[PDB]
Amino acid sequence: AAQTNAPWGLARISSTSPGTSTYYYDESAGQGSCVYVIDTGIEASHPEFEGRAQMVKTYYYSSRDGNGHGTHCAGTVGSRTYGVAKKTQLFGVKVLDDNGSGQYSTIIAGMDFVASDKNNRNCPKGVVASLSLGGGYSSSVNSAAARLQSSGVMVAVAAGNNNADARNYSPASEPSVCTVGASDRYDRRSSFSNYGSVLDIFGPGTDILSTWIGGSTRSISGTSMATPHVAGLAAYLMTLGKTTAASACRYIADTANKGDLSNIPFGTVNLLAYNNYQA
């Protein structure tokens, strides 16, 4: 399948090269997989989700995304225009209030929630979780990411936005999950991407068009926007049969565009997520 005049990041993760605007992907498109967006919530009523999205948890007084962040990230995963994995089932978990703030202990509670709940859902092709959030190093926050991953969920986490080595941030520094940095449409590291040997992979994160609340769209920027490209990609690769929840971060790295970003500091991977469909 081909989707012309696509947001640049969907074209990128289907290209070897920058500078084009079609998104090339196999039509199975994540059918039979499940992606949990653990964030401010998802405006499931957005027609771009077409009935595939459900809130299933909150730790606040409403499950609605009253911020926009969770809806943007979820759209990149799996909205019909703006998503990677256009036939995946989306499940929301609201661990952030309507300003973007979550206490750690609640974020932990969300995370163990997914390791349990996946067992209430129909996900024959595999389960992913997408965490576009974080704060300073915590062993506990990190332990809750290793548990979620260990429970057979592909876990994808934002490296962080301080232009700093990510080993000081959580859940990014955790080893066993898939820590995602960001890039721009000219294959530069985005100016705000944390870096450091704990990163596994980079994704489009600067000027990412996606869904927003009210039924609407916007372009925003962050390792948060990069993260759901890799989550959606992993859902897409499960569904096909290329990899598994426990093998997908390795698998994406093995198949990435290798050398191609500017400004990988020394010691940071220079790997860019790629679906290997067109070549």
Is 175 annotated in a binding site? The answer is yes
Shortest CB 200 distance to Ca ion, Å: 5
Which residues here bind Ca ion, judged by CB under 5 A?
Answer: 200, 249
Q: How would DSSP label each residue in 41-109?
A: ---TTSGGGTT-EEEEEESSS----SSSHHHHHHHHHH-TTT-SSTT-EEEEEE-S-TTS---HHHHHH
| Residue 98 is assigned to a ligand binding site | no
For residue 119, what is the DSSP state?
G
Work out how close the CB of 174 gets to Ca ion at its nearest, in angstroms, rounded to a whole number.
Answer: 9
| Residue 200 annotated as part of some ligand binding site | yes
Written as one string, the DSSP assignment of 161-212 is SSSSBGGGEETTT-TTSEEEEEE-TTSBBPTT--BSTT--EEEE-SSEEEEE
Catalytic residues: 39, 69, 224
Nearest to Ca ion of 90, 233 (CB atom)? 233
As measured in angstroms, the least distance from the Cβ of 227 to Ca ion is: 14
Residue 102 or 171 having the CB closest to Ca ion: 171
Cβ proximity to Ca ion: between 25 and 195 the closer is: 195
Instruction: Kindly state the smallest distance separating residue 203's Cβ from Ca ion, in Å.
Output: 15
Structure tokens at 167: 């080993």
230 assigned to a ligand binding site: no
Helix, strand and coil content of the chain, in percent to the nearest 5, comes to 25, 25, 50
The nearer residue to Ca ion, 184 or 200, going by C-beta atoms, is 200
Q: Are 63 and 57 in contact (CB under 8 A)?
A: yes
Residue nearest to Ca ion (CB): 249
Give CA separation, 212 vs 46, 63, 65, 158, 176, in Å.
9, 16, 10, 19, 31
- Phi and psi at residue 276, to the nearest 5°: 60, 30
Binding residues for Ca(2+): 16, 175, 177, 200, 260
Binding residues: 16, 175, 177, 200, 260
